[PDB]
Amino acid sequence: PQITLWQRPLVTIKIGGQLKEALLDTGADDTVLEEMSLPGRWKPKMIGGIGGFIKVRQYDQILIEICGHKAIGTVLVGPTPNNIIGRNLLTQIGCTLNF
Amino acid sequence: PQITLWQRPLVTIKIGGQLKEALLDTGADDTVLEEMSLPGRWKPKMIGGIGGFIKVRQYDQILIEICGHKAIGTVLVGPTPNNIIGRNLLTQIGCTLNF
Ligand SMILES: *[C]1[C][C](*)[C](*)C(*)(*)(*)(C(*)(*)(*)C(*)(*)(C(*)(*)([C](*)C(*)(*)(C(*)(*)(*)([C](*)*)[C@](*)(*)*)C(*)(*)(*)(*)(*)(=O(*)*)[N@@](*)(*)C(*)(*)([C][C](*)C([N])=O)C(=O)[N][C]([C][C][C][N]C([N])=[N])C([N])=O)[O@](*)(*)*)N(*)(*)(*)C(*)(*)(*)(*)([C](*)*)=O(*)*)[C]1*
Numbered sequence: 001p002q003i004t005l006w007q008r009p010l011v012t013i014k015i016g017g018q019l020k021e022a023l024l025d026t027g028a029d030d031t032v033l034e035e036m037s038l039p040g041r042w043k044p045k046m047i048g049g050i051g052g053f054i055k056v057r058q059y060d061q062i063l064i065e066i067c068g069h070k071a072i073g074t075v076l077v078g079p080t081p082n083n084i085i086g087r088n089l090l091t092q093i094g095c096t097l098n099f
Numbered sequence: 100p101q102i103t104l105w106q107r108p109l110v111t112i113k114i115g116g117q118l119k120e121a122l123l124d125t126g127a128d129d130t131v132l133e134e135m136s137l138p139g140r141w142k143p144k145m146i147g148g149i150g151g152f153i154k155v156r157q158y159d160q161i162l163i164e165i166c167g168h169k170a171i172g173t174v175l176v177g178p179t180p181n182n183i184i185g186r187n188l189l190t191q192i193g194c195t196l197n198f
Pocket residue numbers: 023025027028029030031032047048049050052080081082084086122124125126127128147148149180181183
């Protein structure tokens with residue numbers, strides 16, 4: 001699809017058996033989801049954004065289906081205000097920016 | 100231009116007689132630029148992102164050239180880590196997301 005930016009670019013993801021909405025973010029290097037239950041092991045980490053730094057847990061090799069499209073990668077789970085699909089997954093479903 | 104997402108989508112903007120680099124950020128409603136010299140009046144405003152809240156000063160109707168295209172809009176200037184062009188200006192230069 002061609003997504004225009006008059007509205008937030010929000011999309012349905014299926015992650016870990018659960019349906020969620022997430023924002024397509026080219027300004028995020030990573031994918032960060034609000035707190036959820038993910039099966040597995042996770043390493044602690046801290047990311048930086050606009051009003052500071054959050055502590056998140058990373059999970060590697062998580063299957064995430066984004067708008068019907070399947071991708072597998074690292075997902076940071078932690079206290080973001082919104083579900084964020086960053087460029088580690090945006091390049092997997094082939095997404096580009098055009099103007 | 101077609102921008103692929105293997106590298107940060109970073110672009111040259113010209114604003115207030117000054118040359119700058121800004122990230123094209125579809126997860127940002129607004130345009131937030133690092134603290135810089137801008138003529139005019141503004142209003143204290145505050146926005147949030149990951150990590151928390153920042154206080155920024157709001158300048159309305161500023162001319163910006165983004166990858167040499169011109170748009171006029173509100174520009175917030177404050178403690179952000181990188182310069183961000185958000186959906187208020189990306190819809191002005193006709194930018195879309197394709198997958
Ligand atoms: C909140 C809710 C809504 C949505 C949002 C999104 C956001 C974004 C922005 C951006 C800018 C640049 C600030 C960010 O922040 N990004 C981030 C993401 C996360 C991850 N991790 O991925 C990033 O990318 N970060 C980084 C860091 C860098 C910086 N530096 C310092 N700080 N020092 C990493 N790597 O991490 O789009 N929005 C807003 C508005 O903010 C959320």
